[PDB]
Design an enzyme around this catalytic site. Structure first.
Site, PDB file in Angstrom:
ATOM      1  N   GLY A  11       0.767  -1.235   0.000  1.00 46.97           N
ATOM      2  CA  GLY A  11       0.000   0.000   0.000  1.00 46.97           C
ATOM      3  C   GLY A  11       0.803   1.293   0.000  1.00 46.97           C
ATOM      4  O   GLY A  11       1.930   1.354   0.528  1.00 46.97           O
ATOM      5  N   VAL A  17       4.590   4.769   2.381  1.00 42.31           N
ATOM      6  CA  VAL A  17       4.454   3.442   1.843  1.00 42.31           C
ATOM      7  C   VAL A  17       4.317   2.458   3.013  1.00 42.31           C
ATOM      8  O   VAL A  17       4.920   2.648   4.077  1.00 42.31           O
ATOM      9  CB  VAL A  17       5.640   3.073   0.981  1.00 42.31           C
ATOM     10  CG1 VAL A  17       6.955   3.057   1.809  1.00 42.31           C
ATOM     11  CG2 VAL A  17       5.378   1.716   0.264  1.00 42.31           C
ATOM     12  N   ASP A 121     -10.713   8.653  10.096  1.00 42.80           N
ATOM     13  CA  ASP A 121     -10.571   8.275   8.691  1.00 42.80           C
ATOM     14  C   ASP A 121     -10.889   6.821   8.383  1.00 42.80           C
ATOM     15  O   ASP A 121     -10.185   6.149   7.601  1.00 42.80           O
ATOM     16  CB  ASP A 121      -9.198   8.689   8.152  1.00 42.80           C
ATOM     17  CG  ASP A 121      -9.157   8.752   6.642  1.00 42.80           C
ATOM     18  OD1 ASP A 121     -10.218   8.973   6.005  1.00 42.80           O
ATOM     19  OD2 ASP A 121      -8.097   8.565   5.986  1.00 42.80           O
TER      20      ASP A 121
END
Ligand SMILES: CS(=O)(=O)c1ccc(Nc2cc(Cl)nc3ccnn23)cc1
Length: 292
Positions: A11, A17, A121
């Site tokens: 991801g 990263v 989030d």
């Protein structure tokens, strides 16, 4: 870093990263996040998360801080809810398994929220599953440590799809209720096989919310017309019935979703109360067959 060897990229997360990596000593396989170069408040904030431990929160194993770069080391899980939703597209996730996932994610929220830690989030990409029928929330507490940017280090647009209306209306202080809103969005998404509110800018996001839920007013949401980005000129849409939004979810399910999607965050159900809703009276823990 030299204690780890990178197995693969898994991801480009919000901050850097994410790698599947191996602990060259202890052999353990871990998820390794590099954090976009850090200030002392963040280190202290991250460090408090090491203690916030729950079976439905991806365990933070370590924080590594060298040459002024930052690395978080996490418990590794093999699959997220988006992949699994894609895999399940033709029949959809069975309702018993949606209910068990909802029920576990709620327990995870109820734990962090009891400690005043919010996620801010939630989205299918940070909801990770294992072969034992468990689901866990990744990255809890990171948005307060590092902020939530418009674009990731890779310029990827951060999704608005799960963002609560108070955040979109410019509220400075938002509460644990913003997490319940996002989980409610993801609930609707599992059931329908489509995102509830797939907005592609801030105003498209609000307008999609408004179209489904009615434009909010002082009646449904006291104080709303006084919010920073509220405008008297918003189009005035009528609410639709939830029977139209999430078929074929049952009455208990539609009742629960409704209370998770209340406009007024003070009135929106808490995680704790959600866990007591009649929708969960018959909850179970199915195993998904997973393809890893
Ligand atoms: C596409 S996927 O389903 O193949 C996939 C694979 C692995 C992961 N793992 C993962 C990804 C991210 Cl971003 N954070 C963490 C933390 C612990 N595991 N983990 C997520 C999704």
């Amino acid at each position: 870093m030299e204690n780890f060897q990178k197995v693969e990229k898994i991801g480009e997360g919000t901050y850097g990263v994410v790698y599947k990596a191996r602990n060259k000593l202890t052999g353990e396989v871990v998820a390794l996040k590099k954090i976009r170069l850090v200030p002392s408040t963040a280190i202290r904030e991250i460090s408090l998360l090491k203690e916030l431990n729950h079976p439905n929160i991806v365990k933070l194993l370590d924080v590594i801080h060298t040459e002024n770069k930052l690395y978080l080391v996490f418990e590794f899980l093999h699959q997220d809810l988006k992949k699994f939703m894609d895999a399940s597209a033709l029949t959809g996730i069975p309702l018993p398994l949606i209910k068990s996932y909802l029920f576990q994610l709620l327990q995870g929220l109820a734990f962090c929220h009891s400690h005043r830690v919010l996620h801010r989030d939630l989205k299918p990409q940070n909801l990770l599953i294992n072969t034992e029928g468990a689901i866990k929330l990744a990255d809890f507490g990171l948005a307060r440590a590092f902020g939530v940017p418009v674009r990731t280090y890779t310029h990827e647009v951060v999704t608005l799809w799960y963002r609560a209306p108070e955040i979109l209306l410019g509220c400075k202080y938002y509460s644990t209720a913003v997490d319940i809103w996002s989980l409610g969005c993801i609930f609707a998404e599992m059931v329908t096989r489509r995102a509830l509110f797939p907005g592609d800018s801030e105003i498209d996001q609000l307008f999609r919310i408004f179209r489904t839920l009615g434009t909010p007013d002082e009646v449904v949401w006291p104080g709303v017309t006084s919010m920073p980005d509220y405008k008297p000129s918003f189009p005035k849409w009528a609410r639709q019935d939830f029977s139209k939004v999430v078929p074929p979810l049952d009455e208990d399910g539609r009742s629960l979703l409704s209370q998770m999607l209340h406009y007024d965050p003070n009135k929106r159900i808490s995680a704790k109360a959600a866990l007591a809703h009649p929708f969960f009276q018959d909850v179970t823990k199915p195993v998904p067959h997973l393809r890893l």
